[PDB]
Structures are given as structure tokens and as C-alpha cells.
Amino acid sequence: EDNHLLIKAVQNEDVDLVQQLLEGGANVNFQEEEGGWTPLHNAVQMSREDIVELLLRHGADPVLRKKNGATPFILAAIAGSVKLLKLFLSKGADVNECDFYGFTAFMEAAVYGKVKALKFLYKRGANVNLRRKTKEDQERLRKGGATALMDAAEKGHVEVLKILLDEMGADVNACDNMGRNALIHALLSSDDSDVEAITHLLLDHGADVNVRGERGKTPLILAVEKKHLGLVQRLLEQEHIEINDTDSDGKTALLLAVELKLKKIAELLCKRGASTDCGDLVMTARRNYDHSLVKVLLSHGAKEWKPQSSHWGAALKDLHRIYRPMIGKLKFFIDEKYKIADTSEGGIYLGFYEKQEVAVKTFCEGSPRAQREVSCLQSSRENSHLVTFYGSESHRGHLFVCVTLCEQTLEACLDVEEDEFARNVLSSIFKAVQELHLSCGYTHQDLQPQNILIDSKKAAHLADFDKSIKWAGDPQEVKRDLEDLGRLVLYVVKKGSISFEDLKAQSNEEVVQLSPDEETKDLIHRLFHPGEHVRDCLSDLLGHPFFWTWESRYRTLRNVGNESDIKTRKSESEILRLLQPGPSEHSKSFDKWTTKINECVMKKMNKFYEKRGNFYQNTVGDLLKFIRNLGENIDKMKLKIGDPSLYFQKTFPDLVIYVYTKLQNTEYRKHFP
Amino acid sequence: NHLLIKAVQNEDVDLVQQLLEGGANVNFQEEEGGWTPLHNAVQMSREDIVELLLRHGADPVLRKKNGATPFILAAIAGSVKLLKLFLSKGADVNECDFYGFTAFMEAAVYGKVKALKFLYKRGANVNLRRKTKEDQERLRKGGATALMDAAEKGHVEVLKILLDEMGADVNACDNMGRNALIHALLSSDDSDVEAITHLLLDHGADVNVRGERGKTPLILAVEKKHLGLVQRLLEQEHIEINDTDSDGKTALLLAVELKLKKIAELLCKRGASTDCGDLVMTARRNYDHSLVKVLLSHGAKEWKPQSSHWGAALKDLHRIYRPMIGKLKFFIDEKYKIADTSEGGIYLGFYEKQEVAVKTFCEGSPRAQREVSCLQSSRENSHLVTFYGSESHRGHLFVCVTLCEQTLEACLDVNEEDEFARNVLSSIFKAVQELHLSCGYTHQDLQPQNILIDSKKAAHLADFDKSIKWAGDPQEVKRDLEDLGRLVLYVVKKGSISFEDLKAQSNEEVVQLSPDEETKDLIHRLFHPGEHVRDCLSDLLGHPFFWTWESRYRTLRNVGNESDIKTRKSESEILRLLQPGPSEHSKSFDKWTTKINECVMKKMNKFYEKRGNFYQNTVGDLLKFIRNLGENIDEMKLKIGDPSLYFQKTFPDLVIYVYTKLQNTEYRKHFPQT
RNA sequence: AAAA
RNA sequence: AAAA
Ligand SMILES: O=c1ccn([C@@H]2O[C@H](COP(=O)(O)O[C@H]3[C@@H](O)CO[C@@H]3CO)[C@@H](OP(=O)(O)O)[C@H]2O)c(=O)[nH]1
Ligand SMILES: Nc1ncnc2c1ncn2[C@@H]1O[C@H](COP(=O)(O)OP(=O)(O)CP(=O)(O)O)[C@@H](O)[C@H]1O
Ligand SMILES: Nc1ncnc2c1ncn2[C@@H]1O[C@H](COP(=O)(O)OP(=O)(O)CP(=O)(O)O)[C@@H](O)[C@H]1O
Ligand SMILES: [Mg+2]
Ligand SMILES: [Mg+2]
Numbered sequence A: 001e002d003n004h005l006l007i008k009a010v011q012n013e014d015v016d017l018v019q020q021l022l023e024g025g026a027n028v029n030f031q032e033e034e035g036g037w038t039p040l041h042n043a044v045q046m047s048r049e050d051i052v053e054l055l056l057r058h059g060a061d062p063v064l065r066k067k068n069g070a071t072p073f074i075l076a077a078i079a080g081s082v083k084l085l086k087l088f089l090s091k092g093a094d095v096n097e098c099d100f101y102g103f104t105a106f107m108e109a110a111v112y113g114k115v116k117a118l119k120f121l122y123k124r125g126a127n128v129n130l131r132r133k134t135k136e137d138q139e140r141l142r143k144g145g146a147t148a149l150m151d152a153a154e155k156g157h158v159e160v161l162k163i164l165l166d167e168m169g170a171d172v173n174a175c176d177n178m179g180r181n182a183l184i185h186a187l188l189s190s191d192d193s194d195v196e197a198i199t200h201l202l203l204d205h206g207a208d209v210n211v212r213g214e215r216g217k218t219p220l221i222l223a224v225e226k227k228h229l230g231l232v233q234r235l236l237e238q239e240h241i242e243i244n245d246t247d248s249d250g251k252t253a254l255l256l257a258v259e260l261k262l263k264k265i266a267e268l269l270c271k272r273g274a275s276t277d278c279g280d281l282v283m284t285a286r287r288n289y290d291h292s293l294v295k296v297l298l299s300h301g302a303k304e305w306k307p308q309s310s311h312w313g314a315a316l317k318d319l320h321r322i323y324r325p326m327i328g329k330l331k332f333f334i335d336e337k338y339k340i341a342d343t344s345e346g347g348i349y350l351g352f353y354e355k356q357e358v359a360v361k362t363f364c365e366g367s368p369r370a371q372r373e374v375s376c377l378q379s380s381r382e383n384s385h386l387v388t389f390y391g392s393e394s395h396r397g398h399l400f401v402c403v404t405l406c407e408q409t410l411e412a413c414l415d416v417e418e419d420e421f422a423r424n425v426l427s428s429i430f431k432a433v434q435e436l437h438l439s440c441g442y443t444h445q446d447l448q449p450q451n452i453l454i455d456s457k458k459a460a461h462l463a464d465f466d467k468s469i470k471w472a473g474d475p476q477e478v479k480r481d482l483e484d485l486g487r488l489v490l491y492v493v494k495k496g497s498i499s500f501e502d503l504k505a506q507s508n509e510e511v512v513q514l515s516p517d518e519e520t521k522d523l524i525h526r527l528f529h530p531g532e533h534v535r536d537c538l539s540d541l542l543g544h545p546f547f548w549t550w551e552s553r554y555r556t557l558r559n560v561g562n563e564s565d566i567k568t569r570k571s572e573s574e575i576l577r578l579l580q581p582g583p584s585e586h587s588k589s590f591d592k593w594t595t596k597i598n599e600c601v602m603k604k605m606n607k608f609y610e611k612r613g614n615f616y617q618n619t620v621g622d623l624l625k626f627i628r629n630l631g632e633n634i635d636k637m638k639l640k641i642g643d644p645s646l647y648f649q650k651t652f653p654d655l656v657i658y659v660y661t662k663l664q665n666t667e668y669r670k671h672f673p
Numbered sequence B: 001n002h003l004l005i006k007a008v009q010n011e012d013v014d015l016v017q018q019l020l021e022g023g024a025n026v027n028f029q030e031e032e033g034g035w036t037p038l039h040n041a042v043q044m045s046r047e048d049i050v051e052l053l054l055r056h057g058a059d060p061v062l063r064k065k066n067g068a069t070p071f072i073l074a075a076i077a078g079s080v081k082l083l084k085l086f087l088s089k090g091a092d093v094n095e096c097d098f099y100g101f102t103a104f105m106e107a108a109v110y111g112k113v114k115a116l117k118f119l120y121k122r123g124a125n126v127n128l129r130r131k132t133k134e135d136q137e138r139l140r141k142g143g144a145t146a147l148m149d150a151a152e153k154g155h156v157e158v159l160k161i162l163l164d165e166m167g168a169d170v171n172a173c174d175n176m177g178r179n180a181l182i183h184a185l186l187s188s189d190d191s192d193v194e195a196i197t198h199l200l201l202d203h204g205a206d207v208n209v210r211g212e213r214g215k216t217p218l219i220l221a222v223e224k225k226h227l228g229l230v231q232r233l234l235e236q237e238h239i240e241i242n243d244t245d246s247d248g249k250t251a252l253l254l255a256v257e258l259k260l261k262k263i264a265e266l267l268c269k270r271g272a273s274t275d276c277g278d279l280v281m282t283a284r285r286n287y288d289h290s291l292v293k294v295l296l297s298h299g300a301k302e303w304k305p306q307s308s309h310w311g312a313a314l315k316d317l318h319r320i321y322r323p324m325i326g327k328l329k330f331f332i333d334e335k336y337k338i339a340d341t342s343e344g345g346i347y348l349g350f351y352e353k354q355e356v357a358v359k360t361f362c363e364g365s366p367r368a369q370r371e372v373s374c375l376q377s378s379r380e381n382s383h384l385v386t387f388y389g390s391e392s393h394r395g396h397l398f399v400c401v402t403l404c405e406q407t408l409e410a411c412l413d414v415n416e417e418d419e420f421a422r423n424v425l426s427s428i429f430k431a432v433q434e435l436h437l438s439c440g441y442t443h444q445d446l447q448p449q450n451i452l453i454d455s456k457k458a459a460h461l462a463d464f465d466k467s468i469k470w471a472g473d474p475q476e477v478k479r480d481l482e483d484l485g486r487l488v489l490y491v492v493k494k495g496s497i498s499f500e501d502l503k504a505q506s507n508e509e510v511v512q513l514s515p516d517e518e519t520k521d522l523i524h525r526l527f528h529p530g531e532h533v534r535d536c537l538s539d540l541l542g543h544p545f546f547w548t549w550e551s552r553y554r555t556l557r558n559v560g561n562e563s564d565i566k567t568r569k570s571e572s573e574i575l576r577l578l579q580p581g582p583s584e585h586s587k588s589f590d591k592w593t594t595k596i597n598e599c600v601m602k603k604m605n606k607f608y609e610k611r612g613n614f615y616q617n618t619v620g621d622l623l624k625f626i627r628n629l630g631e632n633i634d635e636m637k638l639k640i641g642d643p644s645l646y647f648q649k650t651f652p653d654l655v656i657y658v659y660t661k662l663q664n665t666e667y668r669k670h671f672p673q674t
Numbered sequence C, D: 001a002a003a004a
């Protein structure tokens, strides 16, 4: 702790405490974990020579580097202390030493505008024109290679730059590994406070105006993008500036000037003889209602895809063609023609997010809905059953959230035999909600048919998260999603014939009793009454008979009927005691099943046992045996029975669920599909 | 019709005269904006051309698509003569376009002094707030005034005239709650922001009105790094110096973060609270000793990763200071490096508070373009690594995708049925299929180091910096397919054979390297797709290679259960389908009864000594044998052991034989579900 | 806020 | 280019 006290004592420049701690035995060379900072590094950074000397006399290593490889000597240049630079040079520092990114003391003096340090270092033999040597990894990225002059230019240090050029023989035209020279660096200054003076100085010393920065940006183009008439004027006074250069977007200085509505700059470019054959110049000026610029351009000789979506697409084709100003990566138009729906904070609109067609949900940037929607979407990219989040753009207090463009909602789809659609839609939604809860850590709170979106596939996707809640642990929030999911099950099974709102209006038990079949009834009940194992609820329910095809249900009935213990009614057999009813279970459809079957097929099946008289009896096992046996020889009866899967399910609607419930947690699970 | 508009746009009076006198439509509206020849003439401020169009019957008040009238356009152009002309033609001085813009507002927007003065004297309502469409209003658009327009557009003379001569309300607010002062500080034209700000304050503008992120004028001025604006705002009596934006940041904290020493010191001198955040530590990080001392003298104060492999490093990265690059927080450094790369490396990162892998590129590069264009186009492909986003900084491009634990190659470096091989190859097949057919690209670099493994352990396709459009070249698809075939062999061999020499040997050599018939047949089909190239990977997902041993065993039992097989029917479809013939070479099951245990064999024949016939060496009988034995064992286990393994071991060519024979018949119903 |  |  005394070690951490030492560093704090130094940081607060408390000489007495530092003395006290050192004389008490504190580790004078202690390095803090992430950074490798020592008391000495801190003392130099505070520019406190007295504290520095105190530390050295207590045994501080004078050249011990921190994690980025910086020495106390180099830090002394950053602080601008000639006294400290002198001291460390007498303690073994080398004037041209560098950190692990290649920064020397001289460069740092230039970076920080430290004139006296800079002069002192020069006179102690600092190499003025060293280009930074950095790590191999950085070098592949074209990092490294910068010089003190570039540093002075980029940081806007006019006096340092003058001294470098006139007194220290700095190479004005050196380039970094990105190909940038001092002039480019100056025009990349975030501190526009001295850019003009800097630019004048560099140009007068023979700086090359025809050099490129990152995105193909020339000095002239950067000056135009700074909207700086003075910079542009000075650059155009160069005798051999290449006025028609284009950036990485193929844009000239003139085109950019017109696009940025810089009339005076544009006119100057034209008068200097910039080509007007470089884009839609006149149309752009016209679009910006600049009649004066339109005339200037003309008097200087200026001239004059397939959508994925079916439902949208006619509109998307129009949106793809029309002019629209970009908002970051998003091209769209808040207009009735491109509106998908009305919304509390605007609407849903067609858009292109990275040339990709998307739906755009608008928000007031600060709003509770905005942060709920965006927080969930940012955290749920790995969830495949959610609508996929492309990205978001903020503009002027507005937030535009971009998301997979879908054809229609589940509700609209339903407004347009085995119901396979219900099965795989609910399956996708179950998986969506599950991943949301367990992986994403959110609940939805607004599970309803309008928020289920249908692909052109037609695959379903969960959407609308502006009422979602981050999960802290309150089981009531999960329960709400589950009981909306239960109502969603019934909504889909009923094919939208019952609105979702009056399903919400009625109780759980009323929703359950509204179920048209035992599978949906049992599934919904389980959603409404999950165990203590709420976490595994949706996982388990994906294996519920509701999701079994009619062929699969029929197959498992036959599979269980094929158990030899069933085929030969073994008394105390495990499967038979498992399948037995009990007080007080039943008004079951199959309590006297042999009487429910056709007379002809039943007597024909019983014929197989007439020698010993082991006829079928009204036990659940014999019924399963009956189903297994009938299934086998059926490959006359086929007409009298019809679809065998459909037949047994129709006359015994509670059988499948009964078998599942009975064998759900035993080794006989193996018979399930 | 088009020639007339063009004639007007070129101010060619004579040509306009000729076209009009020649019977051109004078009220033609172009498709994009509903522009007429008259709208253009007014925009060009050509009263002579306007008068010409009117005398040929141009509707003087016909609006374009956004609702703007010629009268409103005249204000934009700044033409008093045209404004006067249209008022005499039925224009109302306070009329507006569909977004609420009046002629007066437009004069203010465009800084047209003479137009503005004329309109005011003709009764323009100076203090109207824009009424816009219902949809825009729900977004809190609308509500702006001419004064806000002048302020935002930097029109100083217009602003003074509005304030001093026209009774403009200095403190009106738009629907976002912004006043003129806020609008002034949103000018993209900092040439006049000081004068505008000074003038508004002198007329009693409210300094404490919020902008669009909890931003006060003070905070906005600090963010402009503008000392003059900051000085002037601090001179206002009821300035709220301690207000925080929606990030909870004060003007002082932002000043320190932005390394604005003079501004920060001024704020401190004006009495700003120094309990704002890590003020001092931020100043230290920026090596500003003088700022540290100023702060101190004014009394300043002195989560779980998902990844296992990465995790410790992610915890460190989460904790340390790092400057943000847009939505990305990362550190190009060995400690956080995943791999070396041609244009930098792969690194740990947080893209929107989410852990990701970051691939670095030189921003212009061919590799960068190929990687990013593929990723942007493939977001709906669930089997690819998921694209979070990209950041472009200073000629560098940083591409963020899901962070995976390890590669396929690393994973497999670390009797049994190879469950892993089927599951990884299934995912990769679906990945490639979607890339080709949905995303419309070819990968071109299918190899084990580009298959990434989840914590699940699910497989994902990555690395797209060599991907191609795709434009129609079958050869491009072919290359992916034969890389895929080699990937199959590579995985089945558990990585014991390097992928590079797999690539070095021919297709026939790779096929012949297969250790079992299922991989052999699957690889051959990848190397030799038919006319159905597009459905190749989709069809092959149903190949026996992807059937579990249980499922292979089951289909055999299913086929063996056919009645025609049990009752060796004279002319049955299934028996003739299963029948070999010329010149099918010697299968392992040709004399199968001799290959059985064969104490098991006599026990099996025991079922047919009273009724029926003993097993013969036909394929049908072997399938019946398999079906029967399955039934018996379910009711022998010690002799056979695992039955699926048993039949596959002694008859390795049986499963593929049955599949090939029955593939395009109704008997495919006996196959597994997927 | 808004044109081939 | 780079500290708790
Ligand atoms: O190793 C074995 C061999 C056979 N069996 C069963 O013994 C019965 C004989 O059938 P098979 O002789 O093979 O054939 C029948 C018809 O299938 C068509 O021709 C014949 C009739 O004329 C069938 O049982 P069950 O019919 O379900 O009672 C078979 O499963 C075993 O259990 N284990
Ligand atoms: N990605 C998309 N593709 C197609 N249609 C979409 C869509 N996203 C939303 N929609 C449509 O717009 C409707 C509304 O979108 P959304 O559900 O996200 O807003 P919302 O319900 O939260 C607004 P409010 O609460 O005020 O009613 C959806 O029900 C759907 O009809
Ligand atoms: N999302 C991710 N998660 C974990 N590791 C990843 C990863 N993305 C890439 N890697 C690792 O980094 C290695 C290289 O990444 P990547 O394949 O994308 O670059 P690359 O092969 O195109 C560069 P080069 O051509 O120079 O060899 C990968 O093989 C893998 O080991
Ligand atoms: Mg909704
Ligand atoms: Mg909602």
C-alpha cells in the first residue's frame, strides 16, 4: 500500500510525504500494473525536479521504461523541462532514444510545442529528420514513419515549425508510411487555429502540393472540405497544383465545393481553370437553389438494379433512383410514398443501409423507446430468429434504426388438413423468445402478431423491441412473455379468426379451454404453468407433441405399441404401470376403445388371436398394440380407415398427449420422434 | 415538353419564345419534383422568362411536389419584382409548402434582405412556427421560425433586422425544443456564429435551453473548442455551468477530454464543480501538468465476458482507458492480438459494448473492399460469422465480426462415431450454399483456418477478403466446391493430413484417400456435380455421410421391412431396384451369410426352419436379416455388440449401395428426415 | 426540407 | 501512440 501511496504522493506533489514514504522504506521503483508507470515517470510528468532528484537519490532507476517504452528522458521532453532533459542525459539517456512506437524526445518536444526543450535537444545532437520506426504489426497497417515536422504541423505549433524549417534543417517533403507529408498533416489538424500560417510556411519552404492523404485527399481537396477560402486561395497560388485531382470517391475539389455549397470557393476554382467536366455540377447547384453558382458553372463550360422484396420494390426501385442526401450509411426519405407504417415517434420506412434494402424505424434520439429498442438490438446480433440489426444512424436529435426488410406481419399473412404453417411459425417464435431470454438477457413485453414478421420465404422473425426490458431476475417479466406466447399459440392455431386483443382480454384458463385440440391445449397450459424449471421451458416445449407432424405422432404410437412387454401383457411390467391411469384421471376417449372402432376392422384384427382367444382388451397398452399391428399390415382396411394417422387422432384425440405425458421422463422417451 | 424546361434552365429567351409559340406545353411538370417551366424561371430569377410563360398561359400558383409555389420560389431567389408579381396573381403572403415553409422563412433561410423587407411590409407573419406533416411531427420535426433559419444559416444582417425591426420572438422554440440560440450553434458556418450568438444574448435569448442530446449552449460551445463563445456565455447571469448532457457530461469534463486548457481553466474560474468525472486522471493521460494543477487547485478529486479462451484479456481491455473509434473500443497491441494479418492483424474489441474480433485493413485496399462488400451483403446468412460493423479512421479500416474461440484446425488438433465431423461439415455446407445462392458470392479461400468454432461448439465461415461477386462463372463455384471436398476429407481425417498437400493432390487422389464409402461418395459428388449445380449442396445435406449411425441402421431396417423382401416376390419393384447386375463389381455383401458370426447365423435361421426359407446371399435377404436382428436385439447383444457398427464394419459398402439404388424412387421414404 |  |  505504501507503494501506491508513493505514486499518489508524487502525483499530488507532496514533497514531505514523498520524503516520508521513501525514508520509511517504500519501493522507489514500483510499477503500477496497467501502464508500467513508476514514481519517477510521475515526477517527471509533473515536471518536479526536486521530487525527481529525491527519487533518484533513493535509488530510482533513471532509465526504467514504462509499458509503451517511454523513458523518463522522453517524458521530460513532453513536460518541456530542459533541466530534466539535461539531468537524464547525465544519467545515461541517449538523446536519440525512442519508445516502442518510435517517438524520440525531439519529436515529443515538437508534438507538445516545447520550444526550449526542442532547442536544447537539437544542440545535444537530436536527429531532426528521423522517421518513426514502429512495430511490425503497425507497419503492415501503414502506420509509422512520421517526423517532428509533421508533428508540429498536425498539432498547430507555428513557432516550432518555423524553428524546424529555418534553424534545424527539417526536410519539408518527407513522407510517413501512409504517404502523408507535413502539409497533409497540417490540413488534418483538429486545431484549425493556425492552419493558415502553418500552410503558408510549408508552401514557402517548397512543400509538395501534389501529394495524397488517406482517402485520396489532396491538400486542395482538404482545404475545400475545411470550407476555408483562405487556404484554397493560397494553395491555388502554387504554380503547379493539379487542380483536377480526384479523391477515392472520384470527386474533384470543384465538385466537392459545389456539393458543400461553397460558392466563392467554387467560383475561384473555375477562375483558376478547374475542369467542369467532373460530375453533376449544374444539377447540384440547381438543387441547392444557387442560381448565381449555376451561371458561374455554365459560363465555365459545365455540361447538362433489382430489389429483393416483392411487396415493396416498386417503391424501392423509385427510392433507389431518386436523389437523396445520405445520412451516414443510410439513404432514405421520410415520405408517405416510402412509409411502411405509422409509429409513436414517426414511422417505419423503406431504406438502403449499405446499399442493402432495409426497414427504418424512426425515434426521437433521447427517448425511452429509442434506448429500449437499440439496447436490445445491439445485444442480440447472434440471435438468428430475431429480425437482424443492420445498424443505426443519429442525425439532428433523430435516431434511425435499420433492420431486415420483411414482406408482411403474421397477422396480415393469416388474413390471406395438417396446419404445417402454424407449427414452424410457432417453432421459430419459441426459439426467438428463448434466445432473447437466455442469450440476449432481455424479455420482449410486446409479443403479438404485428411484431412477428414474415420473410418472402416465408420464414418468421421476432421484431419490435422498444418495450423490451433488460433481465435482472424478476420472474414476472418472463411470465408475461410466456402468457402472451400462449395466447399467440392459440391465435395462430385459430388462423387469426380470433383477434389477439380479446385473447389478451380473457384469463389463462379461458384461453386454454378455447383450444381446438389436446396438443394445443396441453402446450398452452404448460406455457401458463411452467415448473420451477422456467429456464428450460421453451427448450422442452420444442419437443412437445404440438410440434410433432401427424406422421410422427402416428409413428411414436406404433413404436410404443411395438414394445414386447405391451405385445404380451406382462403384469408388473414397467411400461404397463407407467401407462396405467389413476384416481382421478379419466373420462378418456379410449376407456372402452374397442367399442369405438369399426365393427369390421376390429373383428378382422381380433381374428389373429382366435386360436388362443387372446383378443384385444380395453387397456391403453392393447390400443397401442392395436395401432402398431394395424399400421404394419395396412402396408381393404385402408379405405374403411383412410389416413391411419388422422383416424386414430380423430377417434382418440387425447391419446398422443396421454402417451407423451406418461412417458415424457422415462427411457421410453426413445420412441418419441 | 422537356425541351421547354431545358430552354428555361439555359436562360435562352429566344428558344423559349420559339417553343412556346410552337405550341409546347407551358404547364408540363417533370416527374421527380413536379417542377414546371415557371418554377425553373423563378428559380433562375428571370422575370422576362416568367412573364413570357404567364402570357402563354402558365398557371401562376401551380405547386410542385413539396407544395412550393412560384411565389415561395421567388423569395428563395430574392426577387422583389417576382414576389410582387405573384401576389397580384393570387398568391397569399403567408402561404406555405407542405413542410410549412413560407416565403418569409425562405427569405431568412437564403439571407435575402430585400425580399424579407418587402414581405414584412406586405404582412408576412414574422413569428409563424412551421406546421409540417403529422408523421414528421411525431418525430418532433417542425415548429421552427424565420429567426431560427437566419441564426442557423449565419445571416447576421437578417437576424438583426428580424430582432430590431420586425418584432421577432427571440425565445420561440421548435418542436424539438430548440430556440434560435441553439440553432445558431448548429450552423455549419462558424464564420458568423459569434456575432449571431452575441446578438441573440444581447436581445435576451435563454442560455439554458437544451439542444439535441441534453446539450446546453455552453456545452455546445465547448465542443466547438471556441473560447470566445465560451467566454460570452459565461458572462450571462443565469448560465447553468454545471448542467450535464445526456451522457452525464458537464462542460468542464468535455473541455478536459477535448484538451481545451484555457476553456477548462475559465470554467474553473467561473466556479464550475470539479466533481464531474475523472477530470484529473484525464488531464494526466494527456500529459497536461498545468491543467492537472489548475484542476487540483479548484478542488478536483484524486461485467463478464462470454468467451472462455479470450476472457482474461477481454476483462483487461474492458477496464483500461482507450479512446473510442466511433462505436469501437480496441487496442492494437500484442496482449490483445488474435492473429497476424497481411494488413495488420485480428484483435479483441468491443463494438457496441459487445465483444468482437477486429480485422484491420488499409482503408483503400482490394482486400478491404472484398471483405467489407461481402460482409455488408451477407447479414441474412446465419452460418457466416456475423457482421457487427466497421469503422474507418485515418486511412485504416476496422471490421468487426463475432469473436470465436478457435479455428477448425486448432480444434481437431485436440470405434467412436465422429459426431463432430458431421456437425461442422453440415454448418459449412449451409454456409457455402447461402454464400453462393443468397449472398451471391464465392468464397475462394475455403480452408480449416477460415472455419471458426463457437463456444458451442458451432462452426462459422469467415475471412472474405478474397471473395468474388459472383457474376456467372461456373469455374468460380467449382473452386469452392473442390476446396469443400478437400475440407470434407481434412475433417474426416481429424486434421492428420495437412490441408496444403490435400490441395496439392488431384481430385481422384483425394476421393481415393477417403477412409469410408460415405465420405468417398460425398467427395466424388462434390467433385462431379451434374446439371443441378445450384442444388448440389442442398441435395448433399441428405447424403448418408450426414446420417447418424443410428439413422443408417434404421433405414436399412426400414428397407428390410418391405413385404416384398420378406416374401421374395416374383416381380417386385424393390427387389429389381436392389438387384446389382453388370458390371457392378464385387460388393462386400456378395456372399454375406458366410461373413456372419456365424453362431448368430444359425440362431437367425432358426426362425425359418419350421416356416419359410433360410437366408440366401441376396441383398434383400441381408436387409431382412438386419431388420429381424434389430427386432430380436430390442427384445445376442454380447455377440454382435453395437449392431449399427457391426453391419457397417463387415459391410462398409452397404449403406451407400442402398442409398444409390433407392435415391430417386418412392423407397426414399425409408431415409432419415433431413 | 425540398428535382431531369 | 501512449495509465491506477
Ligand atoms: O429373426 C427373426 C425372424 C422373424 N421374426 C418374426 O417372426 C415373424 C415371421 O415373419 P416372416 O416369416 O419373416 O414373414 C412373414 C410375413 O412377413 C410375410 O411372409 C411371412 C408370412 O407368410 C414376424 O413377426 P410378426 O409377423 O410381426 O408376428 C417376424 O417379425 C423375428 O422376430 N425374428
Ligand atoms: N422490418 C420490417 N419489415 C416490414 N414491416 C415492418 C418491419 N418493422 C415493422 N414493420 C411494420 O410496422 C409495424 C410497426 O413496427 P413496430 O412494431 O416495430 O413499431 P411499434 O409497434 O413499436 C410502434 P407503436 O408502439 O406506437 O404502435 C409493424 O407491426 C409492421 O407492420
Ligand atoms: N472472428 C474471429 N474469432 C477468432 N479468431 C479469428 C476470427 N477471425 C480471424 N481469426 C483468426 O485470425 C486468423 C486470420 O484471420 P483471417 O482469416 O480473417 O485473415 P486472413 O487469412 O485473410 C489474412 P492473410 O491472407 O494475410 O493470411 C484466422 O485464421 C483465425 O485464426
Ligand atoms: Mg409493434
Ligand atoms: Mg413496440
Ligand SMILES: [Mg+2]
Pocket (backbone or CB within 6 Å): B449, B450, B463
Ligand atoms: Mg484466413
Ligand SMILES: [Mg+2]
Pocket (backbone or CB within 6 Å): B445, B463, B464, B465, B466
Ligand atoms: Mg483472407
